[PDB]
């Protein structure tokens, strides 16, 4: 499976020559194929013989008829427009409280401003992802305390529990097969402990 972003996150001014603005990333071909509303909104706007390039392929529009083609990664950034999409969304759900028991951190992601994210694993498969940021978000004040423990678990490979909040959803990863929410806690526990 693959997570397909929603239509309302498109940006009105694409990046010039392959540099999207802050808190933004390029659109992948796979996500483009699997969306109807995005295809519909791409048409009715592109005209003439305008060509566009995506992250892992090429897009022919205007009078070409809307033909999508596959290509090498980052192999077409030289054009004057690249589709860029935001990576932040408000869900409107209440202040939940969820946990996922035994998990191990495996991957890290970071960029200018933005946030630091981690991917948690159980027996070789992704389970959930969490992100923390000192620039925006409801839980910005907790960054200086969580970053220490996140460094410690990543370096030492400690099996921990993860407290997450499903108020916000992020799409920082490319072709993700998991959801992403905001981190709100972490605990190292013995089996059956009460302090967790």
């Amino acid at each position, epitope marked *: *499976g693959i997570v397909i972003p929603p239509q309302e996150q498109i940006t009105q001014h694409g990046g010039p020559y392959g540099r999207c603005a802050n808190k933004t990333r390029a659109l992948t071909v796979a996500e483009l*194929r*699997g969306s109807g509303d995005l295809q519909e909104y791409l048409r009715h706007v592109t005209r003439g013989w305008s060509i566009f390039a995506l992250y892992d392929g090429t897009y022919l529009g205007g009078e070409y008829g809307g033909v999508i083609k596959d290509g090498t990664p980052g192999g077409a950034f030289d054009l004057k427009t690249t589709f860029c999409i935001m990576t932040t969304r408000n869900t409107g759900q209440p202040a939940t409280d969820h946990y996922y028991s035994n998990v191990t951190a495996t991957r890290l992601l970071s960029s200018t401003n933005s946030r630091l994210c981690a991917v948690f694993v159980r027996s070789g498969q992704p389970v959930i992802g969490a992100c923390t940021s000192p620039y925006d978000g409801k839980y910005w004040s907790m960054y200086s305390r969580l970053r220490k423990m996140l460094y410690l678990i990543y370096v030492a490979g400690i099996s921990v529990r993860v407290h997450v909040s499903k108020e916000e959803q992020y799409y920082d990863y490319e072709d993700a097969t998991f959801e992403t929410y905001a981190l709100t806690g972490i605990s190292i526990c013995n089996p059956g402990s009460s302090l967790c």
Partner: antibody
Amino acid sequence: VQVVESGGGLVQPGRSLRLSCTTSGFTFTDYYVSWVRQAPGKALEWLGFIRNKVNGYTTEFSSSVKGRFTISRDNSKSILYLQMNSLKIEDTAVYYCARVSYYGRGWYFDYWGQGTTLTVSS
Amino acid sequence: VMTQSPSSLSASVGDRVTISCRASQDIDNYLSWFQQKPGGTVKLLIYYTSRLHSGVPSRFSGSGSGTDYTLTISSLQPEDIATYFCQQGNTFPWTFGGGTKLEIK
């Protein structure tokens, strides 16, 4: 893996009817399901699909049927229903229930059922 | 829109036969095949341009690029009488073909 449809028979103009497609052998919460028809004269026509758990079970259709047919899931029973509104005098066709698999960077179908027969007269 | 030719074709035992299947424009190798038995049965045969589904006998083969795609069976056997189609998945909505019948005489 077994996929079998049920429901149908005969219907008159303006009468609704819901079809049942009941599956087994796989985790129902992770895959897609589609409904295709075969009106006399071949020309199989694709209609719609429902999404999986990771995407929130969204729905996308085709043609101008938007505002007529709907799709709903009962995750606790592995049963999916298809609801139709006022059936057109030509809607007669064998309805097919099929599952969608994902490979490489695209989609396709994989398994097929026997099919159900619906005849609309007046 | 998408079309096929010939509508009907016939052969005998051990007769190599190939069917044509094309589209309006380039579809970027997203073309699939099907086998509709004489009554109430559908089974997929090829999903990518050349990749073969499990359970299908190896005698079937397929190749192509751009707008031209063909399917080739090494040798015909009685069980092969059915109707075949085509389907593309480059962009919504998906579309099927008109059909092609295989007969024996």
